[PDB]
Ligand SMILES: NCCCCCC(=O)O
Ligand SMILES: NCCCCCC(=O)O
Ligand code: NA
């Protein structure tokens with residue numbers, strides 16, 4: 001029993017519709033207008049072959065930039081300095097307005113939605129997760145605070161080894177529809193989360209994608225809105241974005257908050273712009289000045305024991321779904337496997353978006369190359 | 385063995401990627417930019433409750449029109465007289481730019497793509513299906529001509545009883561991903577089509593959705609393009625449409641040509657405009673003047689023995705994926721279950737689009753009400 005969840009549509013029964021009932025009334029009225037949410041679908045282009053490189057000024061400072069982008073399997077790259085796009089790159093086959101999977105950069109967007117609700121006083125990070133999701137009692141989420149979920153400081157028996165077929169990460173994917181279901185798997189993401197356990201210890205950073213989905217669940221319970229709608233209402237609809245974003249959903253219509261969002265590079269940059277603007281977007285304030293300040297300030301350094309991060313960023317940390325480098329530039333970034341970054345460079349009031357498709361999800365090699373590019377581009381923006 | 389099929393992406397192996405391999409290289413580069421084709425996904429609106437009724441002039445002639453539209457579960461309704469939108473209606477909850485499933489109206493779009501290839505001489509309707517799809521040898525499609533598929537004049541052991549769980553129509557849905565798979569089901573739509581049989585007779589009309597998917601298969605073999613791309617290249621991209629259309633795809637990426645297309649009402653009207661313009665669209669000629677003339681002329685009346693159609697349209701017929709009323713106005717229409725119509729009224733140079741969600745897929749009751757509305761609106765457009 002996972003309790004009350006936002007109906008797929010007004011008046012919809014729990015879990016309706018399913019792949020086998022969407023053609024039946026009363027579900028069909030909603031389904032006929034949102035079939036992509038039920039069945040895999042392709043776009044039939046309204047528009048009738050080569051990479052687009054417009055690395056503007058930074059090109060002079062970084063002559064081999066395009067080659068470096070190709071070497072890191074770059075699909076879309078965009079640099080926003082202030083309110084101006086000063087550099088752009090799109091691989092052959094990927095249009096400037098095409099959307100790209102954000103993977104874990106999605107987490108930073110979810111944390112933003114949580115921050116908005118904290119500002120409204122609908123969520124108190126000091127409160128235990130169970131204050132909002134009682135059904136998580138008896139699980140590893142029984143005891144920890146919402147802030148500990150936000151900062152990922154909960155010890156959990158969860159193997160985030162993507163390529164490993166036995167890990168909890170694969171089960172998470174199967175429960176959400178990212179992979180084929182196996183007999184006995186949890187029915188949906190909510191159920192999967194309730195199966196998680198840990199030794200009860202907290203305080204130390206442990207990257208776990210389940211944490212973000214718990215945040216999305218909390219968002220749904222406090223607002224009564226499907227996470228998909230909450231993500232739009234509290235964030236996307238206030239960005240004056242060029243295109244809607246998309247998010248994969250499981251069989252109940254629950255969005256894969258931890259990593260299923262897709263959007264254009266230019267629109268993702270609008271999220272960064274909002275962060276550098278103290279939490280304000282064209283459509284209104286998204287989060288408070290305080291929330292943004294706390295994100296830029298970083299999390300507890302002592303909690304950050306991930307050498308995969310500290311080897312490059314010794315004074316790094318993590319807080320509210322954002323990775324904080326703690327470097328001399330105060331860089332903070334949303335990160336997603338296979339090379340996704342929503343990189344903030346407050347010094348130059350710039351945002352760097354890099355959406356890629358490395359063959360591997362996470363290796364020292366790829367991160368070394370990628371971070372080298374992000375840091376070089378950031379420095380190229382400094383006054384000289 | 386169903387032979388060669390267009391790769392999901394350049395260089396992709398047969399059937400790749402699958403739900404279990406899209407995160408792996410080299411598939412991920414394509415998948416990260418088209419995840420909706422692999423996993424059900426929802427739109428995250430970039431925009432921040434009541435029906436919109438703008439029945440313009442025809443309102444005076446049809447005072448109870450809005451109520452009649454509500455009674456027929458109308459989601460979107462649009463009347464294009466010449467090049468001008470003279471009447472519009474959208475139910476509460478459905479925006480003017482929202483897309484709606486077309487069901488079998490999709491068939492008329494597929495027939496249009498076939499017509500384009502006939503004009504190019506890449507398809508000869510007189511040729512047997514096996515001339516283009518040899519793998520269909522041994523099936524009910526071994527012997528009939530492409531034109532017989534176009535006109536649906538092939539006797540097939542296929543129960544098109546949607547609500548019936550044992551029918552071939554349900555198996556068709558499961559093979560394409562519209563319903564949950566059962567153990568033993570064909571792997572994809574191509575395989576399903578090869579399992580179809582019949583007594584060998586032809587000449588009499590038999591509405592069968594499998595026919596359209598065979599047409600789409602032929603389209604792929606003659607062009608080398610995924611049907612999804614062919615639908616864009618030969619039709620959608622030439623309409624100067626406001627939005628892309630979408631089409632559900634099966635596990636191989638094959639579009640559900642017989643009924644999985646979704647688009648806005650205004651854009652669907654552009655297809656009708658093209659038909660009334662002799663086959664020409666803003667982006668170029670879609671089909672020949674001759675093809676359009678043949679569609680408007682109708683098919684063999686003797687072949688049309690469907691009382692569900694002839695009771696209302698005694699001189700009606702069917703040809704090239706279009707229903708021809710044979711009425712005094714020469715009305716022709718694309719039709720899809722649950723109330724979808726792309727209705728052509730050549731007399732007034734008008735197109736009527738009605739996208740609905742009747743609780744039932746097909747009953748005399750709903751068709752009586754729906755046709756009454758389409759005919760009344762058509763007559764309201766006559767000069768007086
Ligand atoms: N389990 C699917 C991948 C989720 C995203 C994880 C990440 O980007 O770190
Ligand atoms: N088997 C799914 C429905 C296909 C559309 C059929 C029709 O609209 O006539
Ligand atoms: Na806040």
Ligand code: NA
Nearest residue numbers: 499671672675
């Ligand atoms: Na033609």
